[PDB]
Amino acid sequence: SSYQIAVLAGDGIGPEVMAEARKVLKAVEARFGLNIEYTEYDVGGIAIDNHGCPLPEATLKGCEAADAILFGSVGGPKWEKLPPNEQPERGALLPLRGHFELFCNLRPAKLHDGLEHMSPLRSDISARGFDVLCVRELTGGIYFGKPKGRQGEGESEEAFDTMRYSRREISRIARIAFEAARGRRKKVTSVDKANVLACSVLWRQVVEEVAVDFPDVELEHIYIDNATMQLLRRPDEFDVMLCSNLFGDILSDEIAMLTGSMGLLSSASMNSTGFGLFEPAGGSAPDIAGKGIANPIAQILSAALMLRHSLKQEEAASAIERAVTKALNSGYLTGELLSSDQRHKAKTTVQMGDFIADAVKAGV
Amino acid sequence: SSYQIAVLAGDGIGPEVMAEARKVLKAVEARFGLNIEYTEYDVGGIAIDNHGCPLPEATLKGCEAADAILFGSVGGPKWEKLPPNEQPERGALLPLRGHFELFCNLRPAKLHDGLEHMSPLRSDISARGFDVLCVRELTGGIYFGKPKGRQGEGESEEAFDTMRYSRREISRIARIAFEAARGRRKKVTSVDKANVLACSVLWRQVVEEVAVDFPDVELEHIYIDNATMQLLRRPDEFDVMLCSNLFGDILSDEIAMLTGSMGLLSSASMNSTGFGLFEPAGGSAPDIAGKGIANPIAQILSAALMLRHSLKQEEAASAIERAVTKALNSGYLTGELLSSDQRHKAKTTVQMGDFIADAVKAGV
Numbered sequence: 126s127s128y129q130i131a132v133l134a135g136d137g138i139g140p141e142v143m144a145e146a147r148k149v150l151k152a153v154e155a156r157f158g159l160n161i162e163y164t165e166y167d168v169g170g171i172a173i174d175n176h177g178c179p180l181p182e183a184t185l186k187g188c189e190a191a192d193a194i195l196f197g198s199v200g201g202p203k204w205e206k207l208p209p210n211e212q213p214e215r216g217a218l219l220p221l222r223g224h225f226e227l228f229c230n231l232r233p234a235k236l237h238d239g240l241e242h243m244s245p246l247r248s249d250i251s252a253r254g255f256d257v258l259c260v261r262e263l264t265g266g267i268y269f270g271k272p273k274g275r276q277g278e279g280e281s282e283e284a285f286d287t288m289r290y291s292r293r294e295i296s297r298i299a300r301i302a303f304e305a306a307r308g309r310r311k312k313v314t315s316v317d318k319a320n321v322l323a324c325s326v327l328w329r330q331v332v333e334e335v336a337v338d339f340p341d342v343e344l345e346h347i348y349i350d351n352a353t354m355q356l357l358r359r360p361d362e363f364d365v366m367l368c369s370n371l372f373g374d375i376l377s378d379e380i381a382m383l384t385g386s387m388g389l390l391s392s393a394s395m396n397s398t399g400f401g402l403f404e405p406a407g408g409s410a411p412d413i414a415g416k417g418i419a420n421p422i423a424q425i426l427s428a429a430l431m432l433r434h435s436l437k438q439e440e441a442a443s444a445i446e447r448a449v450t451k452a453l454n455s456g457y458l459t460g461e462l463l464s465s466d467q468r469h470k471a472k473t474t475v476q477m478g479d480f481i482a483d484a485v486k487a488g489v
Numbered sequence: 490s491s492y493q494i495a496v497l498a499g500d501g502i503g504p505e506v507m508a509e510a511r512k513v514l515k516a517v518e519a520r521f522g523l524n525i526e527y528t529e530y531d532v533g534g535i536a537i538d539n540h541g542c543p544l545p546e547a548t549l550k551g552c553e554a555a556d557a558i559l560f561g562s563v564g565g566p567k568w569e570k571l572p573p574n575e576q577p578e579r580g581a582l583l584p585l586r587g588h589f590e591l592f593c594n595l596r597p598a599k600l601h602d603g604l605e606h607m608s609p610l611r612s613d614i615s616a617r618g619f620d621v622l623c624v625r626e627l628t629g630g631i632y633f634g635k636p637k638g639r640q641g642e643g644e645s646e647e648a649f650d651t652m653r654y655s656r657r658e659i660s661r662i663a664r665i666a667f668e669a670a671r672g673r674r675k676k677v678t679s680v681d682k683a684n685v686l687a688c689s690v691l692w693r694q695v696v697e698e699v700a701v702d703f704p705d706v707e708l709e710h711i712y713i714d715n716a717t718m719q720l721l722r723r724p725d726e727f728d729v730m731l732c733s734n735l736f737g738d739i740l741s742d743e744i745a746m747l748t749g750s751m752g753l754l755s756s757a758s759m760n761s762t763g764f765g766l767f768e769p770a771g772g773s774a775p776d777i778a779g780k781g782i783a784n785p786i787a788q789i790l791s792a793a794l795m796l797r798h799s800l801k802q803e804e805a806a807s808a809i810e811r812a813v814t815k816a817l818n819s820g821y822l823t824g825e826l827l828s829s830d831q832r833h834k835a836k837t838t839v840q841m842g843d844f845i846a847d848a849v850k851a852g853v
């Protein structure tokens with residue numbers, strides 16, 4: 126029936142790229158006869174300014190009434206020096222994840238045709254190309270373990286965080302990774318520190334238990350330090366990476382940077398009943414905000430994940446995805462995607478959204 | 490007086506590269522009139538085979554009687570399937586670190602002149618070159634925090650590790666990083682997850698406290714996920730990185746791989762009274778063991794750190810270091826350092842050690 130979306134554009138480039146995502150969405154709504162209602166709520170820095178905290182009660186309620194959250198980016202210099210537990214990025218994201226039980230974080234990263242030169246990889250490695258999906262457990266591990274805090278005074282004052290996982294937690298994220306691999310290149314690389322950590326011993330054990338249900342997918346295990354090395358050297362040999370919360374945080378970023386095109390990457394944070402939060406992979410980039418040069422593709426593709434994962438509108442999702450392909454292969458690139466000699470061909474944020482929306486409309 | 494060294498060559502390539510380190514050491518001993526006695530002990534896989542555990546009581550005693558440990562590499566396929574708490578790599582390294590209070594892990598990584606092409610970085614980035622010292626806290630954090638273990642059964646079985654730091658622990662490693670930066674490019678980048686972790690909030694606080702004693706060194710803070718990205722893109726802009734135990738484990742590996750020449754890198758794990766363990770940065774490389782092709786330079790340079798840090802023999806350390814430079818610029822390279830078109834010029838492990846030892850002897 127009529128879908129409800131909580132729009133949380135946040136700070137920096139968030140509102141301007143969100144404008145483009147909504148534009149593209151309007152095209153898909155008209156194409157596929159979707160009936161989607163949107164309500165905007167403040168989150169992050171803007172919420173701190175307007176409401177005194179990064180996740181207002183009305184913002185959370187708004188998300189509880191919605192079928193999905195379409196999320197921009199949060200954070201900036203203006204709030205850097207608040208204490209950590211008042212800061213906008215953590216203060217928005219972790220409580221949304223915890224509250225909605227968004228245990229599943231999906232961050233695909235692919236090296237795009239014709240953008241190899243932007244990859245910080247050596248030209249022969251970037252030429253091989255890569256497509257690595259990071260599947261990261263998002264509501265457990267050391268992010269939410271207790272006890273957490275500090276005790277004591279002076280030299281002996283101590284702080285502490287507890288990484289913990291139960292079998293139930295590990296197997297649910299593992300199944301997501303294996304099921305993803307099934308539809309990709311049939312390999313899961315589980316990434317842990319089982320040589321040091323008791324949580325990792327249990328992780329590696331349970332992922333191997335889950336594997337029995339996927340005789341068709343290869344499973345291998347790698348330690349997180351070695352994975353940072355191998356992703357640099359041979360990223361083409363990984364398909365899906367399965368990670369705990371802290372490890373997937375680290376690895377997903379490394380892989381995104383290896384593309385050299387983070388403005389093209391999006392992410393999906395999902396619970397088990399199809400609600401999720403859909404955001405670009407990269408930050409609020411305050412240094413470029415309000416200028417018309419931010420790449421809106423990550424936000425536009427977030428909207429495509431929203432349509433697929435939460436709204437069960439796979440053709441509309443795929444239409445946005447192909448409209449993005451058409452831009453990228455028809456000379457519609459923003460400045461950060463272009464070599465410095467080709468910079469003068471750069472499209473503005475609005476030109477991008479107008480091109481993408483027009484392709485959806487033309488039946489791409 | 491007469492120094493005592495516990496030689497723990499371990500598994501895989503460990504003994505063959507250690508043979509070269511001892512060879513070079515003999516040259517320096519003769520050059521500088523050092524009186525160094527060595528005793529070999531089994532560690533790792535060899536210890537499991539000879540003694541039933543990776544760190545025999547006699548091996549630990551041997552290290553307690555020595556001024557330093559000169560350590561090779563441990564681990565291999567043969568022991569992969571033991572349980573984690575019987576495995577050779579963790580079973581050797583963590584108890585040595587904990588026992589000797591080796592809180593300070595130093596892993597410098599530099600891109601060497603003429604070896605840029607081996608770096609997995611894009612040619613323009615490798616051309617800029619880099620020199621990044623990772624300083625990693627090695628005896629605290631989540632490696633040794635308690636409680637550690639698991640409880641429960643079935644779906645609800647849980648495992649847990651506790652990351653903890655006290656101010657005393659953080660400030661002692663911080664001082665090491667700042668003091669290192671003072672002698673390098675006067676920048677410390679402290680790497681943490683202060684947006685999520687209570688240990689990281691305390692870490693970032695204490696590093697800023699320590700900073701007052703170093704008005705000459707710049708301090709900046711970066712989150713570990715962002716640091717994985719930035720090291721790939723602009724490794725030239727970091728000097729010293731200051732990390733907790735899990736984070737430095739991850740980052741040190743990434744940086745080592747970015748050189749594209751890990752057989753040149755060594756590490757120093759030091760306590761506060763000048764005893765340490767000195768090892769190559771890379772693994773036991775069982776696939777090449779016993780063939781005469783392993784690069785002995787990492788092990789040779791480990792011996793140079795041993796001389797400097799534990800034995801207070803700075804001229805002898807520096808002589809080994811220059812002998813290595815001479816090899817690298819006189820066509821003495823092992824196979825993994827050469828492009829596949831220049832492979833046929835590769836030196837064997839013994840040729841390397843003989844060249845390096847001969848340069849020390851000739852007064853390099």
Ligand SMILES: CC(C)[C@H](C(=O)O)[C@@H](O)C(=O)O
Pocket residue numbers: 214215218219374684685714
């Ligand atoms: C801001 C921070 C809490 C967050 C995380 O650590 O999950 C961010 O790094 C991310 O990857 O979305």
Ligand SMILES: CC(C)[C@H](C(=O)O)[C@@H](O)C(=O)O
Pocket residue numbers: 320321350578579582583738
């Ligand atoms: C084998 C493992 C315990 C060890 C560590 O995690 O410290 C290793 O990765 C290292 O970097 O020396």
Ligand SMILES: [Mg+2]
Pocket residue numbers: 374375378714
């Ligand atoms: Mg992150």
Ligand SMILES: [Mg+2]
Pocket residue numbers: 350738739742
């Ligand atoms: Mg390591």
